[PDB]
Symmetry: D2
Amino acid sequence: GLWFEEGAEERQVLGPFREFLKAEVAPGAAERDRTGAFPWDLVRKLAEFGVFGALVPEAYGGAGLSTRLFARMVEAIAYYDGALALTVASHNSLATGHILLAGSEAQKEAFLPKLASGEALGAWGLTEPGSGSDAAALKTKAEKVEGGWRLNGTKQFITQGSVAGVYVVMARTDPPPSPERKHQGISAFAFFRPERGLKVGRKEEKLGLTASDTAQLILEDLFVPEEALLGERGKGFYDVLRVLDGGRIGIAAMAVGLGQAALDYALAYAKGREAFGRPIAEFEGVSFKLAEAATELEAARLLYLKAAELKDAGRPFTLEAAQAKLFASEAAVKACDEAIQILGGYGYVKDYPVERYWRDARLTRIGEGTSEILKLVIARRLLEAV
Amino acid sequence: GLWFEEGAEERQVLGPFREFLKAEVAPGAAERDRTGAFPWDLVRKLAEFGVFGALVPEAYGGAGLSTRLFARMVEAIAYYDGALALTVASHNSLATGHILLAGSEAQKEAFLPKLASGEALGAWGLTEPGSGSDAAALKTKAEKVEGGWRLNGTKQFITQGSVAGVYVVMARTDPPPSPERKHQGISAFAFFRPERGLKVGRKEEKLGLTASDTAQLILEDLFVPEEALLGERGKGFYDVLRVLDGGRIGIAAMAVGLGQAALDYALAYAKGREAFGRPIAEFEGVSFKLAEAATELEAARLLYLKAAELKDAGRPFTLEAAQAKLFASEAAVKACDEAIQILGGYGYVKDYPVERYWRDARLTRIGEGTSEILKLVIARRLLEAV
Amino acid sequence: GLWFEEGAEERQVLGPFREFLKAEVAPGAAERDRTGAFPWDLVRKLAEFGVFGALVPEAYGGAGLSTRLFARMVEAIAYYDGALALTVASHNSLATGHILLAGSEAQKEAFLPKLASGEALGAWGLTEPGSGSDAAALKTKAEKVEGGWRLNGTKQFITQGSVAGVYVVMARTDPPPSPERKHQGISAFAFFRPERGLKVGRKEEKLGLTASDTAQLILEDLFVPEEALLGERGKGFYDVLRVLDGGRIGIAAMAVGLGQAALDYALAYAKGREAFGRPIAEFEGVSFKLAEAATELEAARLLYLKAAELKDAGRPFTLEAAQAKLFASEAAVKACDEAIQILGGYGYVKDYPVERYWRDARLTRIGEGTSEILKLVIARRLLEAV
Amino acid sequence: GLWFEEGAEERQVLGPFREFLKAEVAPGAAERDRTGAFPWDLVRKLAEFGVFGALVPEAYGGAGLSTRLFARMVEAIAYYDGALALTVASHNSLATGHILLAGSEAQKEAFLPKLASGEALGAWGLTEPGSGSDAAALKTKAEKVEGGWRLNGTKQFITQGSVAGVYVVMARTDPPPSPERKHQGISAFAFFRPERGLKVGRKEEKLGLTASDTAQLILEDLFVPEEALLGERGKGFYDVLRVLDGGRIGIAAMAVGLGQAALDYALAYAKGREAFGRPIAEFEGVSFKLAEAATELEAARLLYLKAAELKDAGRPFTLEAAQAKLFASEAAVKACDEAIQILGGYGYVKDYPVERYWRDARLTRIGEGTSEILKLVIARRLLEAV
């Protein structure tokens, strides 16, 4: 198999994985989108495929898979269930990926094994009501007290926020030297679900990804031990950036999966549905949409595979991960909107899955860095190289 | 006031109308989008403004308003409630507009008064499971029997389908001379809610316009009197086309209203929300979106006003109505998608109205002629003029 | 007649005007695009029509036409020759328009008569090598001396720069209170072609609009009399913006003219060229383009008509002129690009006019405020009314 | 190294090649664009490099390079001179590629040696005045006569048409079984520059790629020997499509090269030009464009690398070559258009290279299958696999 194709090893894993997804995940996707019922049943089963500890090395109880293979597994999941894919992508990339990145040997031995097994799902709290793109503008604070820390603040839109067993939260431990350096003085804290000090806010009704747990977290004089400190004090934001680079590859894979599903459905539909004495696929008004979407999704897949490769190769991939997520999310939503158009009135009804594909994919242009933010990251990298 | 602005007469009507909408319609829009509960309460009140008989001449119990003023009233409604605007636009344009167009004096006296008052809401059944864009491919049939007709067929996605008091259905009464002339042999039938022969199918769960009644109609040996025949036998499709031309102006106005709402919200939000030490509106990534959307919505408003004028002037407006609806629906959905982007994570939650604006507006690119179909109508008109 | 339509009086002027254009201007458009030879013959013939004094009141020897009619005339000219259109539009809108706006009674009696008759073509020099979008950053200075002022500096891309009989140059006369307000302290100066002190720079070849005089101006100790100061000292920048508001309407009209010509050519072509056994117009890949372009340029036409309307009514039109120019230029260029595509290989050869239409129209997105600048202007106004 | 990256061996060839290009090709690109003077000097110098025999096996005197490496070389050439790139790409892909694909051992020994050394430039004549996209509708005929065939007809837009030493022309030899299958009955003929019978037509000026030989060919009772028949009689069309599949990869590479040059120039420019007190690169209106273009052309590069990869592996690549060409051409032209916008007035003047990049790149969306045609090809393949 050529680089861009699934290798022998990849398809031996992805083949049965896809079969499992078709039989156990696809059937309840439409219902979960309506009820928002978290798939505790599927989490248990996916954990067995090492899906919840995919990048965690076996030494800590993980699957030790590569970024490339995991990215493809996320795309396969998203194809059948967007919410589940966000659940998997975020769990692995943010909470887990952050502990794997800055955690001390002791912290990794304590947290990784439980995250990797699905026993403890990971929530990663960066965003707050008053800051999203400008993440370093967070107001949560961590006061140094006898024996550890006391945290106070609110996190917004945290996935796995209400179902998490392990929480990673960013808070200011020191004042910034200047306003343009507010990213300094921020630290990260890793801890197990507190018995008190952490309450979840009102559930969030979302446009899509209904079964994905997203919640507001309110920390009230929450005490965490000295061992909670993750990474160097005051330099937590630097780790956040690194963590976000990795997560963007997964979100890009997620976008591609939803777009492909929408494209596959519109293709099949256009081939069967007929108008004016022939399949509507025979009208360029329809076929051109399919051709453009397919071309962009393929380009998007190549981009995320490339970004995954650079990471697996221990090489910088900030620019490449930003480009993949930006291109994939934009192309995927576009493809999904066109699939809706192609199905006509049926694209507007919940009896068919394309309207859901669009609603689910739509978040990919917002989460882990809006398209606008990513264009800034890309341009900056391009400009300093000049 | 200049032509494109609201005249003295227009604002004396639209001023209090908008006040009524803000106070009585806007408050329950979000809820209706969640419950799908048809606003019987608001229908009664809107009828008083002559909203359900706007184009019907006073002689038949209508408001006798112009196309231009009604179009603006539809835009004002859509601004606060998409479903209600579709309810109003369709009621007036299709069922009612068709009876006003081809009805005999006797039929107009019997139907118009009740439609115009809101007593009997109008359903217009053209679309079927197997034909949408290719409307003349409908399979419903009308068999000539003693005393009238017997209809058999299924209509799909009929607004006011389950709540209608008056129904207008298209059915084949005669075989077509050839396949390319299948539009021949189709007739229309106007009748009051049957005591039998007409059952509604399973409610339709839609991406948007939740509180809008859309239903499948199954005609089972439904008998209608000789007086049910609307227009000349076998030439009903010609009336359908004429009726669709008029309706497209209303749907264009509808699109503009939803887009404007989305634009107004994103403008206000971008002016308040701040990031990196300043209002996000100060970032071109955001401001450019607002500028493009506003420019296109204005162009869209001018286009539908123009189409409305040509109709009021008794002049052909097929091309102009197609251009207005196409431009407005496309621009409106685009503006709505950008408003979602601008609100970031908040654009993804139902606590805010932009996600609803998009879901509601999305249908405008599909209903009463898909954008693809409209481009065909436009091009054909352009080509024969060459 | 109907507002958005050409009235009886407009047709009486435009109808005969178009025939003149078709017979005297069209024939040599291709050649002028190749040689860049300034059309003195046509300038003289158009002047006899009062085209170069369209907006100048009859009291000063002009035609006393409305902005609406002038815009339509610019569109008509542009349809056949982009360079002539720019020549005519800039002359009337910039140098002439500025004197008509801020000039005293004496200056108007002195300049307007000769500009309106064409005896003197007007050049308006604002842009400099080091500032275009940021025009208030201009460096040309004029220092007070006995009898008047002495101007020193260079101007870039000045239309009519080398053939003009009257010049209006912007130069700093007083230091800016700060950088944030460098616009303050700039003045305007009107004067007949100098006997000495004004040098024309090495002419540069343009992508298009070849036959339009576009020159660099070098002012070396240029002396102008007291009566040269146009408007109040140091307050000329506000006048500059007002002048640009008006010019933008003409540039919008110019863009529409070129896009319409490209559309018309594509229509006729698509109707006669056959592929796969049928006119290519019967392929949606071609017809959809035709439909989209026609729709957008009509919309573009309505926007500049609106802007012109507001101006003729003595009302604010800054936002509207920006929207008209932005949309017309963007839509026109796209339409011209599509026309090239529709002609296939023939769109790439100079024996056909479509590649020239694009090259000519391409400047409309840059001159008199780039599309980017216009979006800022539009957004700011929308935000202020929020 | 990593697949999507230039390997050590590729760099050993490309690195030195680029310096040669920068020093010998770049200097006169602007002048060649103005004079249209065919670069014999550079052709001769490139030939000494085996550039004109890149894909020809060493056994026939060629360089025996992979499709991947050749594509990258075309991108590199195109970066500095579009016309040279087309000259090189068409030569290798079309006339040469066709003989290498369908030619017998004798023909290959006779033609390949001279084509690969550059001693004879290849011209491939398929397109005619009355057929481009519908190439199977060609009218040139070749009738069997004693000793061989006599060809009669005209070819349009033939690259290397007037300077070639070897020609490959497609002509009908047998009547089509029906119109739906006119492709059947077409044959290909390879022959050295005729002593008589071949006439070059009045050269026509192009929008861009001025220095590339593009000529009309008039065949009047042209005689070619028995050994001229390339491939089997009446079955040459299938070979034509295969030849086009390969050529499209080179056209994709060519588009990427031109877009990259435009991007690089815009980057450097945006980094040095200042407005409102800062490099214009710090304005999202500019930086977002830079980010989008960089992202799309990388994506475009990955697509043609993939297509080339499939071809080198002897695997089907029709769909992939179409996608690469479609995306690269569309993205490149847009990037070049944005670069013009970013330079403002300077993008409109010929003293700067961006307006040439666009003019050169514009043909990539038309030649070797228009974007519209490619979408049909892509869609059909997607539908077949559905």
